Design a protein around this ligand. Structure first.
Ligand SMILES: CC(=O)N[C@H]1/C(=N/OC(=O)Nc2ccccc2)O[C@H](CO)[C@@H](O)[C@@H]1O
Ligand SMILES: CCOc1ncnc2ccccc12
Length: 685
């Protein structure tokens, strides 16, 4: 499946062998990056003046003079033709010729080419990725891999702006990169240029910027530095800041200054972009006028970025019309998917969808903000490259499958199985969700109520769950050992481990459903409990970031199914045999008695009670740790401690209820007379 799909495609059914003897026409006047690709394809084939002609070049070249009228008159457009007599690879520009070769390479199968006529061009002018997330910035090697991936999928934009790069954001955005980083950035630009990608260096100065000559000059001096490293596209982000830096009049004036004294002075600067402080409709203030000030004052050639109606949002026709009228220009979309820096315990490997497919002319650009997991993000990036190039023929699921099969041919279905059940973000402050496990959801749904009630589940639904769990284990084990894309595996490995544990736990619970004899049920029960403890261990030792630590997987349909199925069968067992087995579904080494049902959670060196959305009102709550730990503090948000529970030692409190424990021994905590937060922090391992 050609990705992206071309605008115009006519496929006659006839296969042409890749010629052993060929005459190369226009190879010395054509895009070097395109010809190099063409010669890579033809290695063991000799070139002489006798043989099948291959015409490569840009419009205006003598080599493709014949086909100048068949070439699309769009930027980055190209004409491709294959018949039994000659091969034509003609771009409207150099980037167009390169893109003709990327399509040409996909057509090559079994050293055989189909006879085909293609006229192709992008519906959107700028298409690519913005590395603009919070978290560990992409490694150098990952970024090199990304740029080669962009070239293949006809993405012409890479905007560098990792939030946690100290030379991108505050305060060291004033300082030039050290020699080591600078050498690396210089390499990224060279590689980006070979792949026809515009490397856009973004700066994020707004937080501590002052509107004067001094900071103006340092910003321009920093841009001059990047320019010496090869950078020819630049951006200025004013997102996520407070203070004077939020001034629209001043931002416009700054960008116009950059535009007029730098971008227009240099002979070869391409893109100039800015991210406004108000980058979505929901956080746009209607009382004052920020967006219309930018629209009127900012030079038209300058791009303005937009994430949609909300921070995380799908782009609609009415939504983009809303912003465009205010900024007086077509918006440059910053789409915050599959970025997961606010749900860092989830991987987002599902399909790209929700964005309107008819609004191509209403947007100046479209870039995707990704996960800090570079390889894992290629699934979305592949799909965005497809949506961006030809939104009209954009096929959500098909492109998702093609992405997976492109990224990991040796284990496509295993990676498909894994990503099928790792797409939803789970609950979050943005309220942004994605479908997950839709294949098996109807069967999982029906099974649960049937089980919960006296009714009888359909056998088919039961076997569907068995197959799913069995297939998940296969996928997990095969992915772990896969050597085709080692960096990909390193990224997802913790989730793969948790994935397999989920599958195993599910298998054991299904065996508890049948039940048969009593001894067998207990064996499965003890096994499930041990599996809960293993999932707990991974959740506490893998991916321990400061925000959403741990590893969650299959959260939308599967984990609730297994948990609810487990809690119900244990309930029936306690009823039948008059037992008192624990129906808890998440392991918790500590205890909390008394806010009665609220489960405890461990996050790093914190032991906390799961908050609620209700209104709470000489009662007391007690938390018992599994051992004695040195206490740091106790942050309650709307007190007494002991090491044995006999001798209690009162602690004084202070919006936020602070209480230093001063490394005192802690095991029991109590609070005698709404709950936003109830955290005990203890000393770390
Ligand atoms: C324009 C934009 O998307 N900014 C950040 C963005 N976050 O917007 C915020 O919610 N930032 C914020 C909100 C309130 C207080 C402080 C920062 O969306 C992405 C995923 O969350 C981040 O990667 C971006 O860096
Ligand atoms: C001023 C810092 O904010 C942040 N810090 C860390 N992670 C984040 C993830 C999404 C949005 C914001 C974030």
């Amino acid at each position: 499946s050609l990705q992206p799909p071309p605008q115009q495609l006519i496929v006659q059914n006839k296969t042409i062998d890749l010629p052993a003897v060929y005459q190369l026409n226009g190879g010395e006047e054509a895009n070097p990056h395109a010809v190099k690709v063409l010669k890579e394809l033809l290695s063991g084939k000799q070139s002489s003046k006798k043989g099948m002609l291959i015409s490569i070049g840009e419009k205006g070249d003598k080599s493709v003079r014949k086909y100048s009228r068949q070439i699309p008159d769009h930027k980055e457009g190209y004409y491709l033709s294959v018949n039994e007599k000659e091969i034509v690879l003609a771009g409207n520009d150099e980037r167009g010729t390169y893109y003709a070769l990327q399509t040409f390479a996909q057509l090559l199968k079994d050293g055989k080419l189909p006879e085909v006529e293609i006229k192709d061009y992008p519906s959107v002018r700028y298409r690519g990725v913005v590395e603009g997330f919070y978290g560990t910035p992409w490694s150098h090697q990952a970024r090199l891999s990304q740029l080669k991936f962009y070239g293949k999928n006809k993405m012409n934009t890479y905007i560098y702006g990792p939030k946690d790069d100290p030379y991108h954001s505050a305060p060291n955005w004033r300082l030039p990169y050290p020699d080591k980083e600078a050498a690396q950035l210089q390499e990224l630009v060279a590689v980006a240029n070979e792949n026809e990608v515009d490397f856009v260096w973004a700066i994020h100065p707004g937080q501590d910027i002052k509107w004067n000559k001094e900071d103006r000059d340092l910003l321009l001096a920093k841009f001059e530095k990047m320019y010496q490293l090869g950078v020819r596209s630049f951006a200025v982000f004013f997102d996520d800041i407070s203070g004077e830096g939020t001034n629209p009049q001043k931002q416009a004036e700054l960008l116009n200054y950059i535009d007029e004294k730098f971008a227009q002075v240099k002979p070869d600067i391409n893109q100039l972009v800015m991210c406004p402080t108000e980058y979505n409709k929901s956080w746009s203030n209607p009382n004052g006028n920020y967006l219309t000030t930018l629209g009127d004052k900012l030079n038209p050639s300058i791009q303005i970025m937009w994430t949609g109606d909300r921070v995380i949002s799908d782009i609609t026709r009415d939504g983009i019309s809303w912003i465009n009228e205010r900024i007086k220009r077509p918006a440059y979309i910053w789409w915050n998917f599959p970025v997961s820096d606010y749900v860092r315990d989830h991987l987002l490997l599902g399909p790209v969808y929700g964005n309107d497919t008819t609004i191509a002319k209403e947007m100046s650009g479209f870039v995707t903000n990704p996960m800090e997991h570079a390889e894992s993000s290629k699934i979305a990036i592949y799909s965005v490259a497809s949506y961006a190039w030809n939104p009209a023929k954009y096929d959500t699921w098909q492109t998702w499958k093609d992405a997976i099969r492109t990224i990991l041919p040796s284990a496509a279905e295993e990676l498909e199985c894994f990503a099928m059940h790792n797409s939803d973000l789970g609950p979050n402050g943005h309220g942004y969700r994605r479908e997950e496990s839709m294949d098996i959801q109807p069967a999982a749904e029906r099974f649960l109520k049937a089980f919960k009630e006296g009714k009888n589940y359909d056998k088919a639904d039961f076997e569907t769950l068995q197959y799913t769990f069995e297939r998940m284990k296969e996928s997990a084990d095969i992915l772990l050992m896969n050597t085709e894309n080692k960096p990909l595996i390193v990224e997802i490995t913790p989730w793969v481990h948790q994935f397999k544990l989920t599958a195993e736990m599910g298998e054991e619970v299904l065996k508890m459903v049948e039940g048969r004899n009593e001894s067998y049920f207990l064996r499965k029960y003890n096994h499930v409990k041990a599996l809960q403890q293993q999932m707990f261990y991974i959740d506490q030792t893998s991916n321990q970031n400061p925000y959403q630590p741990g590893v969650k997987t299959a959260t939308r349909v599967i984990k609730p199914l297994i948990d609810r199925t487990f809690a119900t069968v244990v309930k029936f067992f306690n009823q039948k045999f008059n037992a008192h087995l624990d129906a808890t579904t998440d392991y918790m080494p500590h205890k909390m008695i008394s806010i009665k049902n609220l489960p405890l959670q461990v996050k790093a060196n914190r032991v906390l009670i799961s908050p609620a959305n209700e209104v709470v009102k000489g009662n007391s709550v007690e938390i018992e740790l599994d051992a004695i730990y040195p206490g740091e503090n106790i942050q309650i948000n709307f007190l007494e401690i002991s090491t044995d529970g006999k001798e209690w030692k009162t602690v004084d409190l202070k919006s936020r209820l602070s209480a230093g424990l001063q490394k005192a021994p802690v095991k029991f905590v109590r609070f005698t007379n709404y709950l936003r937060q109830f955290v005990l922090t203890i000393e770390k391992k």
